[PDB]
Design a protein around this nucleic acid. Structure first.
Length: 69
DNA sequence: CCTTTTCAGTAATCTG
DNA sequence: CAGATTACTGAAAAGG
């Protein structure tokens, strides 16, 4: 299985830069997987695999998301 | 390592 | 249908 989120959801997670572009930073540098969205205008909108973010970061996102078990 | 600004394309949306 | 606009991000650069 896997999960995906929009930069605004991740950038809002602790441990994350805190800026839409900041996310793209680690994204290309770390090589985050990305699901290209479509229903969103511009079509440039793409989510990133939270299951691919640093283990520590995942907890920030999973906790920011409130998923966990 | 992070922050912020500008640039550009298309995508969907709205009307007569 | 036709024309037109707005709206949405992504990308890069520079500096502390």
């Amino acid at each position: 299985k896997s999960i995906w989120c929009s930069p605004q959801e991740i950038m809002a997670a602790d441990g994350m830069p805190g800026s839409v572009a900041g996310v793209h930073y680690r994204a290309n540098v770390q090589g985050w997987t990305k699901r290209k969205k479509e229903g969103v205008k511009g079509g440039k909108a793409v989510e990133y695999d939270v299951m691919s973010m640093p283990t520590k970061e995942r907890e920030q996102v999973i906790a920011h998301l409130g998923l966990s078990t």
